[PDB]
Symmetry: D2
């Protein structure tokens, strides 16, 4: 069974950048529902597959991608944030960002733009392209996960579903983006980088 | 020149079903943004058209559908709600709902399902299929408008973007859908329905 | 584990409406590859499932829908054609078609239009809407199958991938559509329809 | 008003790699239809735009992208081929390919894989990313054009619609991909590349 991961910090730990009510709902209600529905969905697919019921498998794909995507994406996101975060990364990851995007600040502008550019629900990502051996920014719709739908290894995700910011920032998504840099866990992003 | 239409009522007219903060933000910020981006996008398209720049015409399509669709969808949505709304339609529209969906309550179950079923942002619609001469439910992603993308004539729209309910109902989209039945402007939906039969 | 069905007729049986070469390639090569890749993908998806590898499950979805759908769609399509086909259906099916589309000619017009209307590869379908209790026309892209992606029960499918007609009709998909009416197996479409009720 | 560009060579100029029948049909009928439908759609769009009819504009988007894209893609494609082509590109373009893909052969493997991997109709592209200042491989579905939908500047396109190869190669798209390398117009790809610096 899939389980809702524990957060690495308390619901209020990312204040004032992301408030406690957003965090609490996001984790204990939103992501919990993805986990719960992915478990059901995986079970039904196992049944369909055992019968070679191809129609049923195909019909189940939206719930698997959405709930499974949601689980993947939110599990990464929590590890990407920290009450002890913010600042800039160091070492090879910082040099990679400079190599690939010109500078840390240009990188932030491009990931901000990809994140602000999502029309509707979705995610902005910093990923690693294994075949090209460099960093790459991508946007993903709804809960479509980065690696599963594009092959890029996720390093840093920014959730731009309205539930992730509306209570606090209302429709002003760029304000949310500006604030989240203050809580990025660059230590985590660097581990993800070094692992691929 | 497209313009932001005034609401037919004050921001707090739909309380307690849809609160005044949702309404004020929804209209004065969200829809407002779509109107201006629509106008600007249209003017960019006229420039691209005049030069036969097909690449630029295609690059502008996401903004035109998103902002155009948003203007269309929200313009209908406000007219679909009323402080004097709720209850059931009468006449031909109710008999069509019965013939097409079995009963009013079954219709509600089916538009609720369509609306709850949207994964991500989008809209639940009751539409009219002009070719088949009957009612039809459909869901649309993001701001993709009903008639522009499916051919169905919009009768009643239910906005299920999180901005439409999160401040009040948080993740619980079904509680928002339960509530909104209390403020549907069946007079407007009936007007839209009869225009299909004129 | 899935396998390639035999055609109900010989490769040349639908001449002159759909030539022999088109049929032979379409069944022995195209559909065969969907079956083979379907088995391969199901086998990968069970390993992924067993390990809770959700990323791998999602990465396999395009192949499962494409090859899965291909096997589903082609399998129905062969049974929907016949050398003894054509004309128009009878009884309850014909009554529904008049009821839902006006008349048989209007129906043909509508399914033709939906088929001609696919931009790129895909299929036009006459289906049954179980919830509404009536016939419904839909188009599906690529190999996306009708029931698995829309819930409609397939009754008659028209393949408008270029491999289904190009050898013979080149780009003129309307000529193909006109011709295929001559080989529609209405006894099969009827059977599929009665089974929905 | 858009027009069908003449080919830079005769219809049998790319024999035996792409046969004359495919070329003639592809240019004189398939591309010509996109030209016509683009003109019509543009004029309908201008009428819609002049009336403030946003529903009408949005309903025309699929025909504009499909036919407009089809015009863009095929116009590039004819210029990307040559009877005097093949081999490896001369100049900076090869050095860029080696930098971005390792070697020419790995580049051919990657564009081949992107092209073979299109499920249904579409295009494989070698593009240039202006933001990153390097080459990038991308696949596009149907006639969605590279620049208009991804921002990448097209350098080399490989049409993998079935009309582009079925008459000759039947379902064996990889055979077509192998053959087309013999007729790439590197002089034209290089012109498009230098235009990106
Ligand atoms: Mn989220
Ligand atoms: Mn809205
Ligand atoms: Mn086929
Ligand atoms: Mn082509």
């Amino acid at each position: 069974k899939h389980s809702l991961p524990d957060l690495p910090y308390d619901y209020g730990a990312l204040e004032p950048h992301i408030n406690a009510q957003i965090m609490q709902l996001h984790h204990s209600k939103h992501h919990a529902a993805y986990v719960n529905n992915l478990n059901v969905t995986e079970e039904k697919y196992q049944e369909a597959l055992a019968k070679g019921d191809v129609t049923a498998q195909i019909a189940l794909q939206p719930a698997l991608k959405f709930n499974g995507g949601g689980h993947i994406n939110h599990s990464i996101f929590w590890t990407n944030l920290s009450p002890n975060g913010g600042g800039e990364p160091k070492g090879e990851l910082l040099e990679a960002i400079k190599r690939d995007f010109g500078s840390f600040d240009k990188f932030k502008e491009k990931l901000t733009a990809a994140s602000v550019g999502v029309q509707g629900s979705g995610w902005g990502w910093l990923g690693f392209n294994k075949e090209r051996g460099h960093l790459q920014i991508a946007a993903c719709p709804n809960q479509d996960p980065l690696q599963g739908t594009t092959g890029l290894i996720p390093l840093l995700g920014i959730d731009v579903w309205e539930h992730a910011y509306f209570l606090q920032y209302k429709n002003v998504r760029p304000d949310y983006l500006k604030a989240i840099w203050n809580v990025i866990n660059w230590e985590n992003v660097t581990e993800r980088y070094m692992a691929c």
